[PDB]
Design a protein around this ligand. Structure first.
Ligand SMILES: O=C(O)C(=O)CC(=O)c1ccccc1
Ligand SMILES: [Mg+2]
Ligand SMILES: [Mg+2]
Ligand SMILES: [Mg+2]
Length: 714
């Protein structure tokens, strides 16, 4: 029956073999003790994990009933707040405290910069992400719409010199703004030299040094004519590559070939929202990539970068990390996976399993590769825990990590937690959530997409919600973002932990990203999420413009969001929409859902670029699916749309998704809709949306992907 018996557990053979043959060797952990530890942790923690999921369902049923029992008209906020407090949703705020987390890397406690999130099941993307610590500014500007494709500056099959000159000019202006010269502009530089340990820049008429000579961090090659100059601004490195022999350098006034930016400071290897892993075979593929990353031998030959060698201004030698500091995002408390079943045939909680397996694998990252150890030099394992609801759930994750550390023979508190603030019950009790993880917390981050999905589901019974596009400007979300920064700064996060903000999803709109995303470090966020190594390089420009440490100091002690603002439900006003607007929102949500779901169910791809109704390429994950499906479920629940409208929109958008795809492994949905597991999954997400726990998409997606693989097997 392809399973291995260990106590009360029945382990899929592929997982048992992977752990024994690949994960355990080199950790000095006894295989028999590891497996007995897995059995004991699962048996001991499964009841509290179930109790917490039951408490979520109970609180939601109480809120749903409360909204149906409203006669009013404008919601009575005082009565709503009193009700949430009585049911235990809204808990008392604890007294002021400071976090005690220790042994954390400088990339987290001090450096403000981009954070890249990548699906761990894609080895090529995981490799590029780990390597994205250093990225080419010239490649990021040339290859994207940051430099407009106006008449003359368009991209073609070959290098366009007019476009190349615009890239060079943009980078020279970046240098002037970031590392200013004492006199003149970098645009007029003819050369660079290191004289008496000082950077000397040659201008046509004179020579100049830096306005702040401390911004000179080092160089490569000879001091008289360096091969590169290393600068530092706001704790982020900038490297000017000097090579007059190169095609670009030949055309350049100072022979500059490229400007390299320290870009993705940290990377999150994702096992959650951006991947589709429904059984042991899928989990092993992910665990094996995570293992290859920690051992430093993952290779696609594309391999992991080594540290970078530099000469200090004075002449001595030093090194800088060549790779992004890695976190792993485990799944949350909800799902079970049949990778492990108990004697009764009951599936084991996936979050428990992820803590054991990703934690075990992370041990390899704390020791010498095959040279130096890949990841944490300070001895920490960085785990992001998503979708937690309130401080009892955070307390549970901390107990699970403590129990895992005991099984792995690791010091207590080795396993650090990146808290996602992406559920309403966490937002409203944020201070108590940080306190419950006070000795393990390394970040708080506003996962705004899941947070929007939770906002829709929680108040599902209150009335029809505003359009998806209107959500970003609603009072609740603006208060949520500010409250997050306030709670983190009040808990002493400055100099100790990251205060993070969300994902930019418009992958092709890089000019818009460079214009807009600056709002996040201006709001005191020490990091924000980016979808690609190119977006990391461009978002790094924002941290050179904004002094995040100064912004945070200025925000100290402010309380900019009240509990009433956090609780403002995003209900639409009566008569808000004309028929064309309703139809556009329905079609847009159906296209987004079908586009994403078809690749999830039929191909096991958890993150896809899906063009929306306005032909804008959007990076879709489970969280964007949670919003779209919950919004349509909400509109169907309150009579904004009929069941005939939903079906007709799904059938209309299905051939358009089929066209956008084929591909090669692609199976079209139209015309035999009822024979398409992917189409039926999309339909179920909408029609059963109101009945999914907290509006989560995994139960349906996992069930439908498992059904697709079964049909393909027979
Ligand atoms: O906002 C949220 O809930 C995050 O958890 C976002 C997220 O996972 C993501 C990852 C890759 C692509 C698009 C969104
Ligand atoms: Mg109900
Ligand atoms: Mg999320
Ligand atoms: Mg400054």
């Amino acid at each position: 029956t392809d399973r291995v018996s260990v106590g009360n557990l029945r382990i899929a053979r592929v997982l048992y073999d992977f752990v024994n043959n690949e994960a355990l060797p080199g950790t000095d952990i006894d295989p028999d003790s590891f497996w007995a530890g897995v059995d004991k942790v699962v048996a001991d923690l499964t009841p509290q994990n179930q109790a917490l999921l039951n408490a979520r369902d109970e609180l939601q049923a109480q809120i749903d009933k409360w909204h149906r029992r409203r006669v009013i008209e404008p919601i009575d906020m005082d009565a709503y707040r009193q009700f949430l407090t009585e049911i235990g949703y809204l808990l008392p705020e604890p007294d002021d405290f400071t976090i005690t987390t220790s042994g954390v890397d400088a990339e987290i406690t001090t450096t403000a910069g981009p954070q890249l999130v990548v699906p761990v099941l894609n080895a090529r993307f995981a490799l590029n992400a780990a390597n994205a610590r250093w990225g080419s500014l010239y490649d990021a500007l040339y290859g994207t719409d940051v430099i407009p494709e106006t008449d003359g500056a368009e991209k073609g099959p070959t290098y366009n010199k007019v476009r190349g000159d615009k890239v060079i000019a943009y980078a020279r202006k970046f240098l002037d703004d970031s590392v200013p010269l004492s006199s003149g502009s970098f645009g007029d530089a003819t050369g660079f030299t290191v004289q008496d340990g000082q950077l000397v820049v040659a201008l046509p008429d004179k020579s100049t040094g830096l306005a702040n000579p401390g911004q000179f961090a080092g160089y490569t090659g000879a001091a008289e004519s360096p091969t590169s100059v290393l600068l530092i601004n706001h704790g982020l490195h900038i490297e000017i590559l000097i090579d007059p022999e190169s095609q670009v350098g030949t055309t350049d006034r100072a022979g500059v070939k490229d400007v390299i930016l320290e870009s993705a400071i940290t990377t999150i290897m994702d096992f959650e929202d951006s991947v589709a892993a429904v059984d042991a075979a899928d989990k092993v593929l992910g665990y094996r990539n995570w293992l290859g990353l920690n051992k430093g031998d993952l290779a696609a030959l594309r391999v992991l970068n080594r540290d970078r060698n530099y000469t200090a201004p004075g002449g001595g030698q030093f090194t800088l990390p060549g790779r992004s500091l890695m976190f792993v995002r485990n799944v949350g408390h909800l799902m079970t996976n049949d990778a492990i079943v108990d004697t009764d045939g009951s599936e084991v909680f996936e979050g428990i399993m992820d803590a054991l397996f990703t934690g075990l694998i992370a041990i390899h990252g704390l020791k010498a590769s095959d040279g130096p150890l890949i990841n944490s030099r300070t001895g920490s394992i960085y785990i992001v825990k998503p979708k937690m609801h309130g401080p009892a759930e955070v307390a549970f994750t901390c107990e699970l990590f403590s129990r895992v550390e005991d099984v792995l023979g690791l010091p207590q508190n080795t396993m650090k937690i990146g808290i996602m603030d992406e559920e309403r019950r966490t937002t409203v009790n944020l201070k108590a959530c940080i306190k419950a993880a006070a000795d393990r917390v390394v970040f708080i981050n506003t996962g705004f997409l899941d947070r929007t999905g939770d906002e829709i589901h929680t108040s599902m019974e209150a009335g029809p919600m505003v359009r998806k596009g209107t959500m970003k400007s609603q009072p609740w979300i603006l208060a949520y973002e500010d409250h997050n920064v306030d709670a983190g700064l009040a808990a002493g996060f400055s100099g100790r932990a990251q205060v993070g903000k969300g994902m930019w999803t418009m992958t092709e709109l890089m000019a818009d990203m460079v214009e807009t995303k600056i709002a996040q470090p201006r709001a005191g966020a020490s990091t924000a999420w980016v979808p690609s190594p190119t977006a990391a390089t461009l978002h790094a420009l924002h941290y050179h413009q904004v002094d995040v440490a100064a912004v945070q100091q200025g925000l100290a002690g402010k309380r900019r969001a009240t509990i009433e603002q956090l609780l403002t439900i995003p209900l639409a006003k009566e008569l808000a929409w004309a028929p064309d607007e309703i139809r556009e929102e329905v079609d847009n949500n159906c296209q987004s859902i079908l586009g994403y779901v078809v690749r999830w169910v039929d191909q096991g791809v958890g993150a896809s670029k899906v063009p929306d109704i306005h032909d804008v390429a959007l990076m879709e994950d489970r969280a964007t699916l949670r919003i779209s499906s919950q919004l349509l479920a909400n509109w169907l629940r309150h009579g904004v749309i009929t069941s005939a409208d939903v079906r007709a929109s799904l059938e209309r958008m299905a051939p358009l998704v089929d066209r956008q795809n084929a591909d090669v492994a692609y199976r079209p949905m139209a015309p035999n809709f009822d024979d398409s597991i992917a189409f039926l999954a999309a339909q179920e997400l909408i029609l059963s949306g109101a009945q999914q726990p907290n509006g989560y998409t995994e139960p349906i997606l996992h069930r439908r992907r498992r059904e697709f693989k079964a049909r393909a097997a027979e």
